[PDB]
Amino acid sequence: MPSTFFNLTMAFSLSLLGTLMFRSHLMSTLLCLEGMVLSLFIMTSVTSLNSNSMSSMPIPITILVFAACEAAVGLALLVKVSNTYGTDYVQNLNLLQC
Amino acid sequence: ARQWQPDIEWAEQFSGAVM
Amino acid sequence: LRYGLLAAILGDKTTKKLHEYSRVITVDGNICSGKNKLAKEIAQQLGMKHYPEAGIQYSSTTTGDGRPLDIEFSGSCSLEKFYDDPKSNDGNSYRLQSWLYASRLLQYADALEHLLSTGQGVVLERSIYSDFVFLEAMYNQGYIRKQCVDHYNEIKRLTLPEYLPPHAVIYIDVPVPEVQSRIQKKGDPHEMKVTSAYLQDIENAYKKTFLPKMSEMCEVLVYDSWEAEDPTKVVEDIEYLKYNKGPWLKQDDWTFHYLRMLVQDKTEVLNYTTIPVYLPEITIGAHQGSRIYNSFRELPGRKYAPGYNAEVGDKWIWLK
Amino acid sequence: MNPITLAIIYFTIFLGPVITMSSTNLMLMWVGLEFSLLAIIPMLINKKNPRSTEAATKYFVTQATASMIILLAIVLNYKQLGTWMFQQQTNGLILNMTLMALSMKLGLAPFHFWLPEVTQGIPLHMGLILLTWQKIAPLSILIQIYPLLNSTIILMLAITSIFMGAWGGLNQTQMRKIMAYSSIAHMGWMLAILPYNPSLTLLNLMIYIILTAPMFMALMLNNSMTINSISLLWNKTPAMLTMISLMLLSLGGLPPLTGFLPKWIIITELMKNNCLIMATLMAMMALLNLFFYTRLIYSTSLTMFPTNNNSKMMTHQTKTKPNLMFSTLAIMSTMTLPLAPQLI
Amino acid sequence: QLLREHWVHILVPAGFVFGCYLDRKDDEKLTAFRNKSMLFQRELRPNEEVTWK
Amino acid sequence: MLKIILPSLMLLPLTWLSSPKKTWTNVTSYSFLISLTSLTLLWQTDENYKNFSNMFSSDPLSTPLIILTAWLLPLMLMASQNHLKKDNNVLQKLYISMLISLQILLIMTFSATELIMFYILFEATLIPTLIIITRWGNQTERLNAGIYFLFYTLIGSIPLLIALILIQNHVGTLNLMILSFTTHTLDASWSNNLLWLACMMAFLIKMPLYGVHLWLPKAHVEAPIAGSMILAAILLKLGSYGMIRISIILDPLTKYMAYPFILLSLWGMIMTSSICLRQTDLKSLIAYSSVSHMALVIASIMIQTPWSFMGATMLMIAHGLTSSLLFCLANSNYERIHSRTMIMARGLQMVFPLMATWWLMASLANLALPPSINLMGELFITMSLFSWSNFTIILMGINIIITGMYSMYMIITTQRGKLTNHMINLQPSHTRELTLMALHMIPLILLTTSPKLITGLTM
Amino acid sequence: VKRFFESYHEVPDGTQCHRKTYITTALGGICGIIGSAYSVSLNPADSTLEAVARVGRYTFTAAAIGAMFGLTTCVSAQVREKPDDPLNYFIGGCAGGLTLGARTHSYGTAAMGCVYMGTAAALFKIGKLEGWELFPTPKV
Amino acid sequence: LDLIWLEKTIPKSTSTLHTNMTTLTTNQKGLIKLYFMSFLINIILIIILYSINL
Amino acid sequence: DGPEKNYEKTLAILQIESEKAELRLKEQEVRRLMRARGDGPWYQFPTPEKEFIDHSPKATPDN
Amino acid sequence: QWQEDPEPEDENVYAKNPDFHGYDSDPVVDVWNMRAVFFFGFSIVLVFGT
Ligand SMILES: Nc1ncnc2c1ncn2[C@@H]1O[C@H](COP(=O)(O)OP(=O)(O)OP(=O)(O)O)[C@@H](O)[C@H]1O
């Protein structure tokens, strides 16, 4: 349990490192966000099953709900980005500095 | 004689996006 | 109750108002071709209202007492001075051109405010989609420096797409000598002293640019003089048009609503014309501008909002 | 947008923070922050241009990471203590990560790089909401946990926000970025005192909102977005220069206007705790915050710029836009210092 | 009572009267040590109720 | 005091609600009456000073500044009447409102009991001055001038706020009567020397010191006139008053934290008067003379002796009157030639033989003429400095020499000589601008006839 | 380790000059690495080699700053024996500003940095001496 | 003194310093890659400061 | 009016401001003690709610 | 050029109303301004104040 919680926190940190350190595409960033969601889910679920706190077990479903809504609007923004520029790259989004 | 108000050379310096 | 989202929700929608002749229709042509005589009869026959050509004074007529103002309020421009001196250093030419674009723009806005409010159709003549013709004519001559063209095209870029185009356009053509002799038989010392290349460049601009790009969105009805006379035949052609091929088809009640709101506010209409691009032909200096503004707010009917002028005869001013 | 959609979206925007206040669970707190996130993007992206798409993407992608970090802090607290509330005897790393993510949400330096960009990419409204109403729940988190925050990064971030907002607004000709850097500086002043009598943080917040909202209205009345566009105001609507001047001189805090009260009383409560030189630095960079406001109000109110020929049409026509709240909010700013003991 | 372009001459005298009234109100507010200072402290004269008002 | 600053507020509706043709007259006459009713607070039959409330007080240092501030307003208002006569009526009235705001705020400053009241008002004075300098200046350097004049002040004044806040957190009241009777000797540490500097280097900027004076020429040269009157007459004295009030809580640090500032004042006074000896611009010549005068006030307040504070008060008032007078005299020619260059017009006293007497008297006020409250101040602070150190008269004498020189040179190269025959636009004179100089000079004569009033805390 | 930098105050100035010297050098190097990470992330180089060169220049510059600072402070405290004297820190800050304007070819940078860093270091000593606790815990 | 050196020392030094800091500060380019790299640097500095101060 | 008015009004103002100073410093030390130790009404930071605990019989004894 | 008005040339007053005092264009207002100034400034202030 402490082992797997350490590992899950390191996994969160890896996915956070990922979504911070960008590459060309944006879809990969959204996937890193989904991975952070998933690690947080598993942490919450394991704490709830360990402590036998069945009152908090409605929390991870809420996490999944709101994370999926987040993914939805991100993907809609991606649709708009492609309709504008055509190729998903995050380097073409460099005209607000001026 | 007359009060001085700005001119185009004075205004053009406020149109460069970064000043 | 000023129009707004509340009214649209209550049920002052737009698609209920359109019946068949709820149509923005513009008649175009060269300097003397028979536009007003034709537009007037179209409006009579079909049930629209005639919106005459927007000159130097449309804002003045549709504001206040509806009179002409001194030329320093309604611009700083004269058309006579353009005909008798087209290459002035004093930039009367582009000043006039831009003032007239803005006047046509406000004209089109008033038209659309009337159409969507009432459903009644509107006949214009030489709208904002056909004003660049004279600019191109001036620029092919040495009557404009190219920076003014960039100014005009930027303002057009900012103002034009917000509005819907006309359904049909009616470009009546006349050859250049015919219109020139017609000008001679018009009775104006100033229009008489205009060239023929100016008119031919107007015609070239029309036929090349204005006709096809509007045939991509509108129903063109090119006629000639012998066809332009007897408006009833032009009307009888308009009556049987299939009004497809345009952006009017993809309009909902809420697109009409937001257009109606953009058009109900003339300041949002004309904002992108008052940009601070500092051309010497358009800038008027702080001292002169302040003198004009003070002298304008020291006129009858001005100095306050419309209803709040007791010097005119307004009343219940302490209770509005 | 049809009316059903506007009802839904504005209800969601209003309920994000409201859920955030009236919630003891940190997770429903997170839920409220995510409603604020989700519902803002439609109206950011409403005009459908590349600038709006970029603004919305930057906002979304910066706020999602902060949200995930807050959720991590919450889950680590739940593992540690088996509760959904940041007690005492929590880990300073959890609390500091929460603070970092909340600073990224607000827009504080060195997490400030997105706010001026996003603000320039969106209309005057959606800058007002973004800078005023979205700041209220993220601040509520800190206000609810003020005796648990480390008093060191809380001040380094404030100082960085002060300095960087001043220096960024020094050279911005665009007004939508001036407002953003002003937000950064004022959030700095707030966050500096937040561990010290957080009532003053809410004071500065209310003062800042009451100053910014009418300023945004002023920009809205002619869609002014540049020094050269606000300079053509001695012709279009010249009855507003008085209030614009006093509001700018309240924003850059000068004494006789009530915008000096928050800085003054903040310095007071900071000198009551031997936080002296930090307050000195802050008070000395607020002057640079004032400098560009002074430049602006020169440009619009004292040294009337050249105008155009086509601006006389605006004089012909009439207006209706001042909502009758611009007056109240501009006069309750700039003239409410003698009522300061009733404000505190 | 026609064309009162001269009523404005009452504003400054009104301000003076009001200011004198307010100073009177203040020194009514500060009627402590009225006869308790170690320097004067006189007993009240036979027809006296307050010493300086 | 309330009876002085409520009518001053009522002067604003008097402006806005009056006719365009009967607004300068009414406000001018009523301003003269405010000045009249500002003499009740010269009824000091006793040693104890005049407390009207927790807010307001009035000592013999407050009262002359109060009266002078209330008295300048009609003079500013009449001097401001030829220019902005062709301005729109609202613009006129805005000018009037700014001047009256200056009056009110400055009275509140000199009447204040606490230091924070004095701070917020000392800083509120910046906004009218900046507006006057910028919207009504004639040239384009007015903007940089406003920036300088604002930010020198704010840079100096933020530490002042920090020090006042510290003193409140340490003592509890920040009121001047209580800080007088409860002042602990200071431990003589760097933490208190910084406090001294924070308390002083806001006022020393405004007086000004010679190290920092570049705001004052740029503003005097570019403010229309009335801004120049005020900036020469009471905004500089708004620093001396503050020093005289705040120095009481800084003993014994003034014995050694004052050497640099006395020294800067003395040497830079010589430097400034030498500049006045050689300066193309008349409105700058007056300004550098003001620096060379206020430097003596700096040194005097630093010495903190009775003679010294006394002479400081005398020099304050005298310099204010005569400097406003000289700025009026230069504006009188600037309203015709529209040039500040002095050697342009250099042969007057033909056309203006009466103004040329006001010129002479204004200069004799400026240089050390004995039967005058200028020489009384200069002499008494010279005597204080000689007691302090006998080697300061070597500098004061150089100043006296140069100060005769530049003043008489001003008079000569402006009035005496051959008339500039190419100036048909030299209109004869204005009764208005003659009454101005009379109202500046008649007070000097009266105060010379009775300087018992014009002294300060110490006499 | 915080104790490393706390070793700067185990003994007064004028004593243990090399210790304090390369402590301050390490401190400058740390601050330079921070500035370099920021200048390499924002406004990045055209190539990784030039990025490395940027890091090296910034780090060695700030290291030299700290080294000259510590040398000057402990020397001017050994000479003119006066540990409790912020003029030593002023002279050290001026030496740092001089090295800043030497490594970076500018006399104006030299003077500006001399004044600013000297005053900063003077205030640092005054606060370390009188007990100015920046980032203080809340007390009221 | 007054027209060059007192202008070069006190005011113009201030102006040049603040405007040069402005230039090297706010001349950013609109790339979330670089902003987020800096955010990562801040994460690292905050955790290091925590581990050190403690 | 006379000198007694000014003298005694000054005395009133002095006692007022002296009392205010006393109370300001007292408030400072009071806030200091209340925050350093939560003995007082102020700076009593919140604790978990007691009434939402379940005291009923559970499914296991050793709850 | 940028369409500003030119400088209005040097006004002379005493052509119109050669009894001009320094206050206004209307000859009545100048009189009732100088009388106001002289009276309220000399005759009451500088006399009764002394
Ligand atoms: N945009 C423009 N730029 C320059 N001149 C213009 C512009 N629009 C109109 N004009 C001028 O205004 C005049 C308007 O005449 P117009 O072509 O409207 O005739 P009409 O009134 O419609 O009737 P008819 O066509 O029978 O003369 C023309 O002489 C034309 O040169």
Side-chain angles (χ1 to χ4, degrees), chain C residues 31-32 35-36 53 79 83 97 104 126 131 134 191:
Chain C
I31 302 307
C32 293
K35 299 173 297 320
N36 49 61
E53 197 155 318
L79 182 50
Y83 286 128
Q97 189 55 210
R104 290 174 206 291
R126 199 177 265 151
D131 189 273
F134 302 87
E191 305 187 3

Side-chain angles (χ1 to χ4, degrees), chain F residues 22-196:
Chain F
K22 294 171 190 72
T23 174
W24 290 96
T25 314
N26 293 152
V27 71
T28 317
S29 301
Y30 274 107
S31 300
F32 276 125
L33 298 165
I34 305 322
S35 195
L36 179 135
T37 70
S38 70
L39 298 166
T40 180
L41 80 172
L42 273 179
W43 184 276
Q44 192 77 67
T45 65
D46 295 321
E47 73 280 44
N48 64 69
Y49 305 149
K50 278 154 97 70
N51 280 264
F52 311 117
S53 290
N54 277 256
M55 262 195 298
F56 305 124
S57 197
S58 74
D59 312 337
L61 174 66
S62 282
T63 299
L65 275 302
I66 291 278
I67 287 149
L68 188 66
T69 296
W71 173 251
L72 282 172
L73 173 62
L75 318 187
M76 269 194 288
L77 209 61
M78 76 178 57
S80 49
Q81 220 176 333
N82 188 16
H83 67 107
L84 56 75
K85 74 185 166 174
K86 68 212 197 180
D87 280 26
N88 183 31
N89 195 28
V90 168
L91 216 58
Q92 287 185 358
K93 289 162 182 286
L94 195 73
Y95 202 76
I96 311 291
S97 309
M98 289 295 102
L99 299 171
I100 293 153
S101 282
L102 269 162
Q103 193 217 13
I104 299 151
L105 297 164
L106 285 149
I107 284 163
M108 287 176 163
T109 52
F110 301 124
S111 276
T113 44
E114 293 83 26
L115 281 298
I116 283 280
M117 206 178 161
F118 178 83
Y119 172 88
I120 72 190
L121 303 158
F122 158 85
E123 282 282 326
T125 49
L126 289 165
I127 285 148
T129 50
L130 197 76
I131 293 165
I132 291 155
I133 287 154
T134 51
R135 180 53 185 72
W136 282 288
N138 269 285
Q139 298 286 305
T140 183
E141 299 84 48
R142 65 190 176 198
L143 310 178
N144 303 281
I147 281 149
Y148 277 52
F149 153 74
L150 191 77
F151 277 88
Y152 270 83
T153 315
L154 295 161
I155 291 278
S157 82
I158 288 295
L160 199 153
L161 186 65
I162 285 157
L164 294 181
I165 292 281
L166 178 52
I167 293 155
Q168 186 254 315
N169 287 309
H170 185 259
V171 190
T173 178
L174 216 51
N175 189 0
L176 287 160
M177 273 188 293
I178 288 148
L179 296 159
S180 84
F181 310 130
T182 77
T183 174
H184 190 276
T185 191
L186 268 53
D187 206 50
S189 58
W190 303 95
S191 66
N192 296 358
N193 308 354
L194 298 195
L195 198 148
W196 194 101

